[PDB]
Design a protein around this ligand. Structure first.
Ligand SMILES: [K+]
Ligand SMILES: [K+]
Ligand SMILES: [K+]
Ligand SMILES: [Mg+2]
Ligand SMILES: [Mg+2]
Ligand SMILES: [Mg+2]
Ligand SMILES: [Mg+2]
Ligand SMILES: [Mg+2]
Ligand SMILES: [Mg+2]
Ligand SMILES: [Mg+2]
Ligand SMILES: [Mg+2]
Ligand SMILES: [Mg+2]
Ligand SMILES: [Mg+2]
Ligand SMILES: [Mg+2]
Ligand SMILES: [Mg+2]
Ligand SMILES: [Mg+2]
Ligand SMILES: [Mg+2]
Ligand SMILES: [Mg+2]
Ligand SMILES: [Mg+2]
Ligand SMILES: [Mg+2]
Ligand SMILES: [Mg+2]
Ligand SMILES: [Mg+2]
Ligand SMILES: [Mg+2]
Ligand SMILES: [Mg+2]
Ligand SMILES: [Mg+2]
Ligand SMILES: [Mg+2]
Ligand SMILES: [Mg+2]
Ligand SMILES: [Mg+2]
Ligand SMILES: [Mg+2]
Ligand SMILES: [Mg+2]
Ligand SMILES: [Mg+2]
Ligand SMILES: [Mg+2]
Ligand SMILES: [Mg+2]
Ligand SMILES: [Mg+2]
Ligand SMILES: [Mg+2]
Ligand SMILES: [Mg+2]
Ligand SMILES: [Mg+2]
Ligand SMILES: [Mg+2]
Ligand SMILES: [Mg+2]
Ligand SMILES: [Mg+2]
Ligand code: NA
Ligand code: NA
Ligand code: NA
Ligand code: NA
Ligand code: NA
Ligand code: NA
Lengths: 151, 54, 214
RNA sequence: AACGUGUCGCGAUGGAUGACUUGGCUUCCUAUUUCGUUGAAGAACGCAGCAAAGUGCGAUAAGUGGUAUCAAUUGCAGAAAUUGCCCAAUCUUUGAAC
RNA sequence: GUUCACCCACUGACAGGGAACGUGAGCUGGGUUUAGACCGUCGUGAGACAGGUUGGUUUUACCCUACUUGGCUGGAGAUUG
RNA sequence: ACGCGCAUGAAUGGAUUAAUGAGAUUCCCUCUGUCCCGAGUUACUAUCUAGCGAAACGACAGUCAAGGGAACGGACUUGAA
RNA sequence: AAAUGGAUGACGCUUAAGCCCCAUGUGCGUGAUUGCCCAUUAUUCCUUUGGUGAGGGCGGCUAUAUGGUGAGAAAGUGUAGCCCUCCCGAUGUAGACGUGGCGUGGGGGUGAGGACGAAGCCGAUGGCGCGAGCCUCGGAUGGACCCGCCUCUAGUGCAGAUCUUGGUUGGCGUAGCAAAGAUCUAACGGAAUAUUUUUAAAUGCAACGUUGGAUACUGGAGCGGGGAAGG
RNA sequence: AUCGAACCACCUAGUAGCUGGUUCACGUCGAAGUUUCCCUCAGGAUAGCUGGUGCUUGUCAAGAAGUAUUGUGCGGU
RNA sequence: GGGGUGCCCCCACCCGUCUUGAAACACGGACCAAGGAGUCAAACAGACGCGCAAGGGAGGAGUAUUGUGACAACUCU
RNA sequence: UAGGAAGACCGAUAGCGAACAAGUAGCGUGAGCGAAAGUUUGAAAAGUACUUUGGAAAGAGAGUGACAUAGAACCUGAAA
């Protein structure tokens, strides 16, 4: 369920997805950067990341990743271009836009007010190691929820 | 430390106790009151059948 | 494992006698928990005619007449479902112990069975587990006249041995008079008590001094 | 600045706790109570309208016959018997197997 | 195999030592010290010898610090008054 | 070559032997980056990105000097960063 | 005369802040007999706890309604200690013993509670006890049982055993996914595009199958065509 | 995938003077590493040190003293 | 008065363990939940509770009973 | 083999290995070895018609039910 309640429910659209088959750490960085942005601005940023003109800043899960000149606009040095997480977030933003249109709001004035990414149940595989050993090979999905309001 | 005690002769060095590896060798008397009732009932039945012999 | 126990024969007869004497004191009966506020006299002795009853309604009318219906009502209200795992092991309901009616034999109990909160007993074999439930003395007992008159022969007196128990006599008391407060306040004792002595005044305010030089 | 640290409200991950119990364990009693060449115990293969496992049954194959009870079965069909008990029967390939 | 030793040669000079007898997740594995085998001496024998001889797997750093380079960024009440 | 041989020696076999040996040892010719003394180049890695994604290990942690201490301290005393 | 840079503890100190010795308030050759600082020690005071503890009261007649003052008093080892005075001790490993000392599952008694909400669970909910713990409050938690007191009984209290069984975890988006040479192009297919409102490039990347064409490999002891064992 | 005595089940929870562990609170007391014997030297028995339960008594003192004084003996550092 | 979070001056070696001696460059120690170790029987001794006493106490059996009935009661030249 | 009486016993890591398609799945050439797992939603499936975005999975509304943060291996729902 949603962990927060919008202040004016009439002028607010919501969307969420569960057990999304994308890396939790990558999706965590991708979704967190658009908090407080306008809806059209967030869509523009994702399109430019796909073109590899701007980058997503990695702030928490960034141990020993490369440095980029494109991360300077975020006041940082490390960044990346996760395409699998970006296309998933673009699909989710389209669903929230459809909900706003059906409710009667204007998508060109909405502002993203809440973003949250959580860890989902893991899926198990296995890999074969030297000297006849077997060790886990696990997948880490995630949940995503958001809503946006019209000022 | 042992003090002034009697010298023990408890006689319990065979496998009498039932455990995971031994059947044991024991006898209990949980059927004592039930068998007391059974013997009396048989005596009463026999008296009725052989009446009037002592 | 040693499940059962042995008890000396004389000690078992001692306990039964003591639990019977406690039932004649109305203070101990009330302390155990019975309601005897309407009972005419203790111990309660009624006529032999109660053995000829055949209908449960007659028994209920008799109980209300002698004033013993308050205790059976108390047992009726206390019925409830047991707490804990015990209700899973054929012990679902619990209730309290009511009065006990004593008969000269094991006959004439058809009308008194099925009454909830009443117990029947035979004077020829009295059970300590029934006379002192939970280990506490002072059970409420109703006697029939025939059963009451047999108590002297069954248990014997302080000088005459019993006729049913081989060579049994009531144990002698340790004290010829249990009233100890009377002895302490008697005139004979007060004659030889040491006289009282005058005591000092209570200390006032203005704590006393200690420096003997200054 | 950012990272990091801490507290409160909410949400994830996980399946403890409590209350439940057609299961287990232990003791006691009663019988017109003790298998097989007249082929047993075990083992294999099959059988339902839709039926994999399990249950029942054997080419008369989720059953034929007798008796007591007295209107169902039930997921959907389908019809206008079912359930308990038991005498009469059927009883595939094997197995002491001859 | 040597530390040690001893010779040849150059030189101004070929001083003496320590750092877990510096230094094996730096190397090498000649020696020492398994299992195979030969010799001498010893033992009745299985076997022994600080006697000789030949053959005999050298594993793991992505963590913290130290060191080397490489960048981002606050801050004088050393974040506040 | 020599032999007072700690402790050589005759089927516990002595001595010698052409041919043979992935057997042990010494020297010579040829040859070379083994070395004086290192330099340049290629392919795959490492390095950056997309997708995917472990293990080992893990009391707590991680700047030094001297001191004393279970006689070689990250923590204790004094100093210095 | 020694092996990292370093030690009267450091700075520093030379009419000493060094060595040997002598003194003391206000006033040091007229103030005789205390210059000042720091203990789990000594004196004194308050409170607790245990005694080889020591004393005292306990036969309730002065008199008194509410809207001269109001509550208790148990002949007692042990308490919410019957009450009031006084004296002496109090640390401690291995170990012994005591406790009307705490807590858990079930039996016999007694007394209550519950759909106007039991058990369980949550907490910047406070109060009580030296403590084990007990109780109240709130739940925008739960949905059916449970507890106080006296006794009986036991599979009765966890932080570590390279402990057992589950779950979670930093390391970490890290180490890597590097033998067998290699793919390119157009059309079609596909939801996988040529996806923008706030001219074209600088704002929808990357990747998949078939057919035609190109390039190249296996090189007959073959990534050819048939069998046995095994499946 | 096992050999200076294979594998499976059982006797078997084999024995261990040796290593590891052993779950609530407060209160009153509180040590020893020494003697003799033991195939005894990483262990026991035995006396000593300690706790509990007391018994018989006394109340200023019996059968008191890790101390003096007086008298009288012992000794070869 | 209590509770929460910072700040200042002062104080303050890591727990469990064997050991004469542990903060140790001595061993076991990533986190949480639920489990996890002086028990039962038999012989004897001492302390304390209870009954009787120059006597004490049975056992096995037997007699009478859908009733709290596998209990309880009784069994003497 | 048919039945009965029960219990100061255990209460899903306990009690038989097995409260469940358990001597089953699985392992070993073989003799043999051998689990995990309460379907405990709700009184009753009344188990979410229909609108809309989406290839689908699902999301946003609507509806049943006293409660859907009782939505399907669905009571309660702790700690890390
Ligand atoms: K990358
Ligand atoms: K990547
Ligand atoms: K990558
Ligand atoms: Mg790297
Ligand atoms: Mg591999
Ligand atoms: Mg393999
Ligand atoms: Mg029998
Ligand atoms: Mg044949
Ligand atoms: Mg040296
Ligand atoms: Mg060295
Ligand atoms: Mg090495
Ligand atoms: Mg070396
Ligand atoms: Mg080294
Ligand atoms: Mg060699
Ligand atoms: Mg010789
Ligand atoms: Mg000869
Ligand atoms: Mg020879
Ligand atoms: Mg040859
Ligand atoms: Mg050769
Ligand atoms: Mg140092
Ligand atoms: Mg260290
Ligand atoms: Mg000094
Ligand atoms: Mg103490
Ligand atoms: Mg202790
Ligand atoms: Mg239990
Ligand atoms: Mg236990
Ligand atoms: Mg625990
Ligand atoms: Mg990598
Ligand atoms: Mg590799
Ligand atoms: Mg080739
Ligand atoms: Mg070719
Ligand atoms: Mg054992
Ligand atoms: Mg130990
Ligand atoms: Mg002391
Ligand atoms: Mg001897
Ligand atoms: Mg030592
Ligand atoms: Mg220590
Ligand atoms: Mg050290
Ligand atoms: Mg089980
Ligand atoms: Mg739930
Ligand atoms: Na990197
Ligand atoms: Na071929
Ligand atoms: Na030892
Ligand atoms: Na040690
Ligand atoms: Na050790
Ligand atoms: Na099991």
């Amino acid at each position: 369920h949603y962990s927060r309640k919008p202040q004016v429910s009439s002028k607010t659209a919501k969307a969420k997805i569960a057990d999304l088959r994308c890396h939790y750490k990558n999706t965590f960085e991708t979704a967190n950067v658009i908090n407080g942005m306008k809806l059209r601005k967030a869509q523009q940023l994702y399109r430019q990341v796909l073109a590899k003109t701007r980058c997503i800043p990695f702030k928490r899960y960034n141990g020993k990743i490369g440095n980029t000149a494109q991360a300077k606009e975020w006041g940082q040095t490390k960044g990346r271009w996760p395409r699998k997480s970006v296309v998933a977030m673009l699909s989710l933003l389209k669903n929230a836009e459809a909900n706003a249109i059906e409710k009667g709001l204007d998508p060109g004035k909405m502002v993203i007010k809440h973003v949250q990414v959580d860890q989902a149940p893991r899926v198990r595989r296995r890999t074969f190691r030297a000297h006849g050993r077997i060790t886990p090979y696990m997948r880490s999905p995630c949940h995503v929820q958001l809503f946006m309001t019209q000022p | 430390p042992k003090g002034n005690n009697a010298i023990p002769h408890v006689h319990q060095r065979k496998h009498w106790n039932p455990c995971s590896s031994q059947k044991g060798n024991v006898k209990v008397f949980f059927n004592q009151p039930a068998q007391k009732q059974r013997r009396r009932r048989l005596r009463l039945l026999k008296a009725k059948k052989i009446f009037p012999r002592p | 494992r040693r499940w059962h126990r042995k008890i000396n024969l004389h000690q078992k007869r001692f306990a039964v006698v003591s639990a019977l004497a406690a039932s004649s004191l109305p203070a101990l009966v009330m302390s155990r928990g019975h309601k005897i506020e309407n009972v005419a006299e203790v111990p309660l002795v009624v006529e032999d005619g109660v053995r000829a009853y055949e209908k449960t309604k007659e028994a209920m009318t008799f109980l209300k007449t002698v004033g013993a219906i308050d205790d059976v009502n108390r047992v009726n209200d206390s019925r409830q479902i047991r707490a804990g795992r015990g209700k899973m092991r054929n012990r679902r309901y619990v209730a309290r112990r009511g009065p006990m009616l004593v008969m000269p034999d094991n006959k004439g109990t058809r009308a008194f069975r099925n009454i909830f909160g009443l117990d029947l007993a035979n004077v020829n074999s009295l059970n300590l587990l029934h006379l002192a439930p939970g280990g506490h003395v002072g059970r409420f007992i109703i006697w029939t006249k025939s059963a009451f008159e047999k108590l002297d022969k069954i248990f014997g007196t302080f000088t005459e041995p019993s006729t049913v128990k081989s060579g049994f006599m009531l144990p002698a008391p340790m004290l010829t008079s249990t009233d100890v407060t009377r002895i302490m306040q008697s005139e004979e004792v007060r004659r030889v008590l040491k006289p009282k002595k005058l005591q000092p005044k209570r200390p006032s305010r203005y704590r006393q001094p200690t420096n003997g030089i200054r």
